[model samples]
Target: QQQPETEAVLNGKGLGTGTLYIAESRLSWLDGSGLGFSLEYPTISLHAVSRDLNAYPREHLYVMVNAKFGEESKESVAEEEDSDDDVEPIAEFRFVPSDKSALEAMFTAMCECQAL
Candidate 1:
């Protein structure tokens, strides 16, 4: 219920359009009904805004989350040192807005939050 809105990330399970919401390092994508997903800042390992058709044929912002579900993302870092090839579950999400103009500002939002 805060800031910014974009088209749904129709990752196949769709009957209609949903909405994407983000105002910080963390983000949310939900069914048109306001229920779906949340990716916290720590777990959100990477974020980018790309527009290469060769990369998927769409201009969308991408996010790579570090785990399948919520956990101590901070702890997950040092915990990595004690493992062998400990590949965390990274979920990649792509979102494109019908408002093409959202690219720059959206990327700015993503950068500040991630880099902060």
Candidate 2:
């Protein structure tokens, strides 16, 4: 039998808040048999672009981030979503509409490395 590994790369930021971020998930197999796997939560990088202004397109200036985890995360990941029915509770994406909102949202989302 052959086992497969998986990884997730995420990119997001607040358009109005002038922020951008990128992250990559590091997953590896622990054993030669491929029965055991581990997750290395990769570091995250976030940057600021500008201030909140209605002149900018809110939708176009979107904070978009998505991740695709490896097989090891499949079982444990959804296990935390036992409460949600229509949507997946564990993995999700969000966009902030304001500068303050971006800071708060990003802080809550992941660790901040440095805003460029």
Candidate 3:
């Protein structure tokens, strides 16, 4: 939306730094805080383009970050779904830029960055 980078958000109360930073190794989400979110190419389990007003009002990009859902419940330790490989808990990121034209750049840049 702004210049230099696309408007970015990580959905934790939706604080956007208005920047989407992509690099050779990873993607850094610089935000209103002193430090912000960063995800490596490998940690990004999925990515693509999407659109929905029912979902949210925007033509956007999807960046699915991978994380292990290991909540060590002291009492109920046996959920009985996962093995020793750690649970899959993915955080969804949608970059909704002010200008729709730049939407295409986000996906391909991520594609090449991940080398997928």
Candidate 4:
């Protein structure tokens, strides 16, 4: 894992608030559920986009993470309800910075990683 060039604390809808780190080739963050679980997505998996956040403006900025995984050998009942073979796995995290410049900077850092 490479060191992050920039990082910021952002809150998601139900994912709670966590520090999002933009590294040289990866983006990493942890869940705020106190489970100590973390997530990492390659720069290739990140997509710059916009999403609707209830607590913020409708045109809020967000980044989508689309990652792929092998088929589960034994699928659980819960998995069947949330996903399907045709659907691509994805998670979107919204950014709520103190100012517009902060948001743009974070977005730029993430976009820069994709180029590498």
Candidate 5:
């Protein structure tokens, strides 16, 4: 939850020059390394807020590029459907960006996300 541009490193393991590396004992940012994790582009979180005009009131927002990863996967409840059913999947979305807006939109339609 730290802003890389504002924080100073005190000292920790696996530190390097202008690069944040996860050490054997720590997965924290700026633990012993003065360098913070690089944040090229962070995942954009989209949500349906309300209805506006002809489009859904959904806005794309983003968290910090190097923010701590939360355990959102732990809350997923999975269940297998009937094996005989051959229904095609419908809508899909990718929270993480891939390419241009077109490619990103395409990936979103197909619902694909980049691995963290």
Candidate 6:
């Protein structure tokens, strides 16, 4: 996995400056935009990781996570059984590492996280 402080641009609610940190079993980041925020996700939650050729004129990449359908969604997956088929949603996070050298390790972490 990429080391901490890998400077990157995070595409979230808005384009923001961010830094990635590789935890023992998850990935976390600190956003430096707006009021600023931080989040962490278990590797198992990651569903996909891929390069975004159209982004930033470089090897931009994005990670997709199958959001747990509970507190975040407000709708209980068990109560509303149809929710699974109706809205199989994911949270997509895109990043562009400033240094090209960091891409390999970052992508490696992404791939490891999404591995089923």
Q: Which candidate is the best by lDDT?
A: 3
lDDT minimum window of 10 residues, candidate 1:
8-17
Over 1-116, each residue of candidate 2 has an lDDT whose tens digit, in order, gives 11222122234321112223423344333333334444463222232333444775442112233454445644356554446454332332233334455444444444233332
Which is the better candidate, 2 or 5, if ranked by lDDT? 2
lDDT of every model, 2 decimals: 0.53, 0.35, 0.56, 0.45, 0.29, 0.53
Q: What's the count of clashing pairs in each model shown?
A: 0, 4, 0, 0, 2, 0
Candidate 4, residues 3-109: lDDT per residue as tens digits?
A: 22223232233443544455444455644454333345543343443432456563334545555655564554434355345544665544444444556665565
Candidate 2 has what TM-score? 0.22
TM-score of each: 0.47, 0.22, 0.53, 0.43, 0.16, 0.48
Tens-digit per-residue lDDT, 24-110, candidate 1:
456665666756876563234555666435656555665555545445566455343444555435555456565545665666666
Largest TM-score belongs to which candidate?
3
Query: Could you give the candidate ranking by TM-score, starting with the highest?
Result: 3, 6, 1, 4, 2, 5
Worst 10 residues of 6 by lDDT: 42-51
RMSD of every candidate to native, in Å, equals: 7.3, 15.8, 6.1, 7.4, 15.7, 6.0
Greater TM-score among 2 and 5 belongs to 2
Off-target runs (Cα >4 Å) in candidate 4 are: 1-13, 30-38, 42-59, 65-70, 75-98
Candidate 2: stretches off by over 4 Å: 1-54, 57-62, 72-92, 97-116
- The model with the greater TM-score, 1 or 5, is 1
Clashing pairs in 5: 11-32, 12-32
